[PDB]
Amino acid sequence: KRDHRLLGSNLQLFFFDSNVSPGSCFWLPAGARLYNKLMDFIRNEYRIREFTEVITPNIFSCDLWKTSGHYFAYKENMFIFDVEEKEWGLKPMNCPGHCVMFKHMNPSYRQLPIRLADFGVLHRNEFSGALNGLTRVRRFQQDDAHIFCTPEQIQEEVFKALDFLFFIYGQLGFTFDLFLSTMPKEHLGTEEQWKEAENALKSALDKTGRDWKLNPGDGAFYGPKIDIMLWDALKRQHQCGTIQLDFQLPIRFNLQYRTDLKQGYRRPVIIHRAILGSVERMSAVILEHTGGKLPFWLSPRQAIVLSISEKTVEYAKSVERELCRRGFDVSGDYSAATINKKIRESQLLQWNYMLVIGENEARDKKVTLRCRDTTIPQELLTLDQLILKFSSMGFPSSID
Amino acid sequence: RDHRLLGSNLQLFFFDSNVSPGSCFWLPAGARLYNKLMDFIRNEYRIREFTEVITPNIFSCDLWKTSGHYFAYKENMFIFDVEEKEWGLKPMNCPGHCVMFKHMNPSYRQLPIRLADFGVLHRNEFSGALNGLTRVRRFQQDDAHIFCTPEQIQEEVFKALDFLFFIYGQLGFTFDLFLSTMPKEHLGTEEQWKEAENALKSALDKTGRDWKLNPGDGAFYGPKIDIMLWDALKRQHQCGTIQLDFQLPIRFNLQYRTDELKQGYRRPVIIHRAILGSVERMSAVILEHTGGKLPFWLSPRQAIVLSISEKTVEYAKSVERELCRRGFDVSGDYSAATINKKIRESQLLQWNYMLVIGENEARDKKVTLRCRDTTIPQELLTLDQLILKFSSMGFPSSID
Ligand SMILES: [Ca+2]
Ligand SMILES: [Zn+2]
Ligand SMILES: [Zn+2]
């Protein structure tokens, strides 16, 4: 039983209400811990890799999307409303507002690349009949980011973007196929732009040494792309990760930068990219991927403290308290139920560790640590040894 | 000394009054401050057993008819049709949290339930009334709803006062307390209002602090303790509230099973509360409060590495990287400017610390630490000493 809708109920992660907000998700405490941990995983790498998170508005005057050129095509699937007799809408994507920020920042070449990351809430007006769990939603957050760079920087930025994907997907336990899609018949921008960018893309792909397939003429109207199809442990494929070059928004927003239209000024290239895709969808994939057996650094339920008998409950609670104060996601079972009943019950919510506290542990001021994977032998640790162990199982890092 | 001016001079945030008046574009450094302010609160949530959740942003307007917000709030709501049915963007979290409580279906053993939510809220303020971060259309509250038994009201209100006292003390604010009582139009009987106002009054009396009556400003669903803070400029701000709500539990048919409207069930009481008020407003106040000289743990610009000459740039970069890997918000100036000019330039952005790196520092594997307050003498420290100093200036803690 691995459907994410079922796991979201069984593991008390999230639920939907089809009468008050069909297509959006209610994330219970445990679900919200997973959601935020997935984003914080990405953020930890953002710091390592010089991405700068920004915060942008959610609602805009529809002039923004008339500027960006998205209005005619997206209006039908956007939530739109009048504000003082002007047409506004909820954002279905982040890119236009990032162009406004780039414009404001007004950088020179010495400050390129600029890498604006944004986890902002997005909305699309999906038909009610199409709605399905976390896979087809009206409300989602993306690990979205835009790299603004010189044409000469494309190769190195795309190579770093590929490395970033390889790191995250490998830590989530996915494999993946790479696809390069090149200039379609109808295309915005000059041929020299496309040739220069396609060579840099091809060059980055080659430098990884990984296999990759060419899809000639399947690029976007506004730029070539690399598509990444990932494969979960059920051997299903998902298109979550994207690297999409964009010659159009630089022109439409009149983006420019002084070098080493205007003279002496070139246009930046925009790289749209995402790794998780939508946190909502990646959450679903991972839950089905693992059957709900999440790794310690994603898990909402990291360690439960189980008292063998009432006599050790107070000591057992002090252990849970310190673990909570140290930032771990813990709970306790201090009922009069037998210790074996307490273990079986705690298998149900997939706790990564079970801390068994009996008289021997309270006497020697130690803890008995058991793993959800019962093939790993138990350990008798001091609280400080426990904390050191737990601390070594935070986010995997690309510099560690 | 105006937060809008500070946000521009310190490259924190800006406003685009043409594409999104009333919302805010947070630049990288501003978003760092925003998230740190929330992180501060989140740390206290963990200490104080609040559980963050995530709720939709858009809802069928049936929800606000159920909750009773609909009549008085729709004028200020962003409202739109979804498949011929009236929906809106949420301007508060409470109704969604009632939906979640009902789903959770707790017993007395799980009370209190403390749902915290930083979700994005929207209110349609008149454009002629908008004012930077002080009067906005878009904001995130440090919102939380405590669902507790009637018997738990005094202890939970006591703790909510204690939470607020702690936060404001660490931020350096004094404050005045007000009991806002029965407004003209309200839900529930005058007897229910009598019980609720006297419960809040009793909590207020136990604090031993002065407080004042505020007739007419209670919420339509119950009375509230309102807190006005005073900043260093001797200007007052309403940020904090603790509201006692017997009425929404009835609107939503919330019940919980007891130890000994259904038999064996009682309605929970909701305590609404916020301390920051909104990250937007509190950010503005703290900026003005400090004139932009933020404490180390809030600053988005904690230390900048300044190389004295080209020879020490590579070593100085290693110092920057290590600090960044250790979680600190750092940068570097590796330009050809003289060290005195680098120090003056960096002062403009109110870096808490400057790390002066010459060949003497490189040779001995040390840094020269200069404080933003140049009355504090410079120190010569190793990298490990520096990191110990920095680590000791993290989020103030109510258990530290
Ligand atoms: Ca954070
Ligand atoms: Zn984009
Ligand atoms: Zn509320």
PDB file of N, CA, C and O in Angstrom, chain A residues 282-317:
ATOM      1  N   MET A 282       6.934  16.387  -5.569  1.00  0.00           N
ATOM      2  CA  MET A 282       8.096  15.637  -5.095  1.00  0.00           C
ATOM      3  C   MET A 282       7.781  14.911  -3.794  1.00  0.00           C
ATOM      4  O   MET A 282       8.208  13.764  -3.596  1.00  0.00           O
ATOM      5  N   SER A 283       7.008  15.554  -2.909  1.00  0.00           N
ATOM      6  CA  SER A 283       6.577  14.892  -1.682  1.00  0.00           C
ATOM      7  C   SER A 283       5.831  13.605  -1.991  1.00  0.00           C
ATOM      8  O   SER A 283       6.095  12.563  -1.388  1.00  0.00           O
ATOM      9  N   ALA A 284       4.885  13.664  -2.930  1.00  0.00           N
ATOM     10  CA  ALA A 284       4.143  12.471  -3.306  1.00  0.00           C
ATOM     11  C   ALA A 284       5.078  11.390  -3.849  1.00  0.00           C
ATOM     12  O   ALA A 284       5.002  10.227  -3.442  1.00  0.00           O
ATOM     13  N   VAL A 285       5.978  11.761  -4.758  1.00  0.00           N
ATOM     14  CA  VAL A 285       6.875  10.774  -5.362  1.00  0.00           C
ATOM     15  C   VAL A 285       7.719  10.107  -4.285  1.00  0.00           C
ATOM     16  O   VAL A 285       7.838   8.877  -4.235  1.00  0.00           O
ATOM     17  N   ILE A 286       8.287  10.914  -3.382  1.00  0.00           N
ATOM     18  CA  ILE A 286       9.171  10.380  -2.351  1.00  0.00           C
ATOM     19  C   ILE A 286       8.414   9.443  -1.420  1.00  0.00           C
ATOM     20  O   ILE A 286       8.924   8.386  -1.018  1.00  0.00           O
ATOM     21  N   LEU A 287       7.189   9.815  -1.060  1.00  0.00           N
ATOM     22  CA  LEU A 287       6.404   8.959  -0.185  1.00  0.00           C
ATOM     23  C   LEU A 287       6.150   7.612  -0.848  1.00  0.00           C
ATOM     24  O   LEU A 287       6.321   6.564  -0.225  1.00  0.00           O
ATOM     25  N   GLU A 288       5.766   7.620  -2.121  1.00  0.00           N
ATOM     26  CA  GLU A 288       5.558   6.356  -2.825  1.00  0.00           C
ATOM     27  C   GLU A 288       6.881   5.637  -3.073  1.00  0.00           C
ATOM     28  O   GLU A 288       6.971   4.420  -2.900  1.00  0.00           O
ATOM     29  N   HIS A 289       7.909   6.379  -3.479  1.00  0.00           N
ATOM     30  CA  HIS A 289       9.287   5.899  -3.570  1.00  0.00           C
ATOM     31  C   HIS A 289       9.696   5.035  -2.375  1.00  0.00           C
ATOM     32  O   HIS A 289      10.116   3.884  -2.533  1.00  0.00           O
ATOM     33  N   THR A 290       9.577   5.592  -1.166  1.00  0.00           N
ATOM     34  CA  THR A 290      10.039   4.958   0.066  1.00  0.00           C
ATOM     35  C   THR A 290       8.957   4.152   0.766  1.00  0.00           C
ATOM     36  O   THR A 290       9.236   3.527   1.796  1.00  0.00           O
ATOM     37  N   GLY A 291       7.728   4.164   0.258  1.00  0.00           N
ATOM     38  CA  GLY A 291       6.652   3.591   1.043  1.00  0.00           C
ATOM     39  C   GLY A 291       6.461   4.264   2.385  1.00  0.00           C
ATOM     40  O   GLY A 291       5.920   3.650   3.309  1.00  0.00           O
ATOM     41  N   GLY A 292       6.902   5.517   2.526  1.00  0.00           N
ATOM     42  CA  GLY A 292       6.785   6.229   3.787  1.00  0.00           C
ATOM     43  C   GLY A 292       7.959   6.048   4.724  1.00  0.00           C
ATOM     44  O   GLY A 292       7.955   6.636   5.809  1.00  0.00           O
ATOM     45  N   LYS A 293       8.956   5.242   4.346  1.00  0.00           N
ATOM     46  CA  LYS A 293      10.166   5.031   5.144  1.00  0.00           C
ATOM     47  C   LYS A 293      11.168   6.115   4.785  1.00  0.00           C
ATOM     48  O   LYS A 293      12.051   5.933   3.948  1.00  0.00           O
ATOM     49  N   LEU A 294      11.031   7.239   5.432  1.00  0.00           N
ATOM     50  CA  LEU A 294      11.822   8.387   5.027  1.00  0.00           C
ATOM     51  C   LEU A 294      13.177   8.348   5.714  1.00  0.00           C
ATOM     52  O   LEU A 294      13.294   7.851   6.835  1.00  0.00           O
ATOM     53  N   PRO A 295      14.218   8.847   5.052  1.00  0.00           N
ATOM     54  CA  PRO A 295      15.515   8.993   5.721  1.00  0.00           C
ATOM     55  C   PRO A 295      15.440  10.001   6.867  1.00  0.00           C
ATOM     56  O   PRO A 295      14.602  10.903   6.892  1.00  0.00           O
ATOM     57  N   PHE A 296      16.353   9.830   7.826  1.00  0.00           N
ATOM     58  CA  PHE A 296      16.314  10.599   9.069  1.00  0.00           C
ATOM     59  C   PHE A 296      16.199  12.101   8.817  1.00  0.00           C
ATOM     60  O   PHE A 296      15.429  12.798   9.496  1.00  0.00           O
ATOM     61  N   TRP A 297      16.935  12.620   7.834  1.00  0.00           N
ATOM     62  CA  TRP A 297      16.934  14.065   7.607  1.00  0.00           C
ATOM     63  C   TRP A 297      15.727  14.566   6.814  1.00  0.00           C
ATOM     64  O   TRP A 297      15.602  15.779   6.605  1.00  0.00           O
ATOM     65  N   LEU A 298      14.842  13.686   6.352  1.00  0.00           N
ATOM     66  CA  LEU A 298      13.553  14.113   5.807  1.00  0.00           C
ATOM     67  C   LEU A 298      12.388  13.765   6.712  1.00  0.00           C
ATOM     68  O   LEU A 298      11.278  14.261   6.488  1.00  0.00           O
ATOM     69  N   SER A 299      12.602  12.898   7.680  1.00  0.00           N
ATOM     70  CA  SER A 299      11.527  12.271   8.417  1.00  0.00           C
ATOM     71  C   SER A 299      10.889  13.259   9.380  1.00  0.00           C
ATOM     72  O   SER A 299      11.595  13.975  10.093  1.00  0.00           O
ATOM     73  N   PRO A 300       9.557  13.282   9.445  1.00  0.00           N
ATOM     74  CA  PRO A 300       8.872  14.072  10.476  1.00  0.00           C
ATOM     75  C   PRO A 300       8.871  13.406  11.839  1.00  0.00           C
ATOM     76  O   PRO A 300       8.529  14.066  12.835  1.00  0.00           O
ATOM     77  N   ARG A 301       9.214  12.115  11.905  1.00  0.00           N
ATOM     78  CA  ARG A 301       9.144  11.318  13.127  1.00  0.00           C
ATOM     79  C   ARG A 301      10.481  10.593  13.274  1.00  0.00           C
ATOM     80  O   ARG A 301      10.643   9.466  12.802  1.00  0.00           O
ATOM     81  N   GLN A 302      11.433  11.258  13.932  1.00  0.00           N
ATOM     82  CA  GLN A 302      12.838  10.872  13.974  1.00  0.00           C
ATOM     83  C   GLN A 302      13.159   9.890  15.095  1.00  0.00           C
ATOM     84  O   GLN A 302      13.962   8.974  14.895  1.00  0.00           O
ATOM     85  N   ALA A 303      12.568  10.070  16.276  1.00  0.00           N
ATOM     86  CA  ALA A 303      12.870   9.215  17.418  1.00  0.00           C
ATOM     87  C   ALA A 303      11.720   9.292  18.408  1.00  0.00           C
ATOM     88  O   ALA A 303      11.293  10.390  18.767  1.00  0.00           O
ATOM     89  N   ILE A 304      11.245   8.140  18.874  1.00  0.00           N
ATOM     90  CA  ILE A 304      10.213   8.085  19.898  1.00  0.00           C
ATOM     91  C   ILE A 304      10.811   7.456  21.145  1.00  0.00           C
ATOM     92  O   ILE A 304      11.596   6.503  21.059  1.00  0.00           O
ATOM     93  N   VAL A 305      10.477   8.015  22.306  1.00  0.00           N
ATOM     94  CA  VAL A 305      10.975   7.518  23.585  1.00  0.00           C
ATOM     95  C   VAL A 305       9.916   6.618  24.199  1.00  0.00           C
ATOM     96  O   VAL A 305       8.760   7.029  24.375  1.00  0.00           O
ATOM     97  N   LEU A 306      10.309   5.394  24.531  1.00  0.00           N
ATOM     98  CA  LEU A 306       9.402   4.397  25.074  1.00  0.00           C
ATOM     99  C   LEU A 306       9.875   4.006  26.465  1.00  0.00           C
ATOM    100  O   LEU A 306      10.996   3.505  26.626  1.00  0.00           O
ATOM    101  N   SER A 307       9.022   4.226  27.463  1.00  0.00           N
ATOM    102  CA  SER A 307       9.328   3.861  28.836  1.00  0.00           C
ATOM    103  C   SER A 307       8.905   2.423  29.080  1.00  0.00           C
ATOM    104  O   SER A 307       7.766   2.046  28.783  1.00  0.00           O
ATOM    105  N   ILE A 308       9.826   1.623  29.613  1.00  0.00           N
ATOM    106  CA  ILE A 308       9.513   0.226  29.890  1.00  0.00           C
ATOM    107  C   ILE A 308       8.493   0.117  31.017  1.00  0.00           C
ATOM    108  O   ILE A 308       7.612  -0.750  30.995  1.00  0.00           O
ATOM    109  N   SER A 309       8.576   1.002  32.004  1.00  0.00           N
ATOM    110  CA  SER A 309       7.652   0.972  33.126  1.00  0.00           C
ATOM    111  C   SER A 309       7.588   2.362  33.743  1.00  0.00           C
ATOM    112  O   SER A 309       8.440   3.218  33.491  1.00  0.00           O
ATOM    113  N   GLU A 310       6.563   2.565  34.575  1.00  0.00           N
ATOM    114  CA  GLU A 310       6.329   3.873  35.178  1.00  0.00           C
ATOM    115  C   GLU A 310       7.549   4.392  35.932  1.00  0.00           C
ATOM    116  O   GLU A 310       7.800   5.601  35.936  1.00  0.00           O
ATOM    117  N   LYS A 311       8.326   3.501  36.558  1.00  0.00           N
ATOM    118  CA  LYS A 311       9.451   3.942  37.380  1.00  0.00           C
ATOM    119  C   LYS A 311      10.461   4.773  36.587  1.00  0.00           C
ATOM    120  O   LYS A 311      11.098   5.673  37.148  1.00  0.00           O
ATOM    121  N   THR A 312      10.619   4.508  35.291  1.00  0.00           N
ATOM    122  CA  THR A 312      11.612   5.222  34.499  1.00  0.00           C
ATOM    123  C   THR A 312      11.015   6.357  33.677  1.00  0.00           C
ATOM    124  O   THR A 312      11.737   6.987  32.896  1.00  0.00           O
ATOM    125  N   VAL A 313       9.727   6.652  33.855  1.00  0.00           N
ATOM    126  CA  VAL A 313       9.056   7.609  32.980  1.00  0.00           C
ATOM    127  C   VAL A 313       9.688   8.992  33.093  1.00  0.00           C
ATOM    128  O   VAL A 313       9.924   9.662  32.081  1.00  0.00           O
ATOM    129  N   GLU A 314       9.976   9.444  34.318  1.00  0.00           N
ATOM    130  CA  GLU A 314      10.511  10.795  34.474  1.00  0.00           C
ATOM    131  C   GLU A 314      11.877  10.927  33.808  1.00  0.00           C
ATOM    132  O   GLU A 314      12.127  11.888  33.071  1.00  0.00           O
ATOM    133  N   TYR A 315      12.773   9.964  34.038  1.00  0.00           N
ATOM    134  CA  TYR A 315      14.033   9.968  33.300  1.00  0.00           C
ATOM    135  C   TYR A 315      13.786   9.886  31.799  1.00  0.00           C
ATOM    136  O   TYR A 315      14.420  10.604  31.017  1.00  0.00           O
ATOM    137  N   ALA A 316      12.844   9.038  31.379  1.00  0.00           N
ATOM    138  CA  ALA A 316      12.565   8.883  29.955  1.00  0.00           C
ATOM    139  C   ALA A 316      12.070  10.186  29.343  1.00  0.00           C
ATOM    140  O   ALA A 316      12.385  10.498  28.187  1.00  0.00           O
ATOM    141  N   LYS A 317      11.286  10.951  30.100  1.00  0.00           N
ATOM    142  CA  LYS A 317      10.817  12.246  29.621  1.00  0.00           C
ATOM    143  C   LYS A 317      11.956  13.250  29.513  1.00  0.00           C
ATOM    144  O   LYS A 317      11.989  14.056  28.577  1.00  0.00           O
TER     145      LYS A 317
END
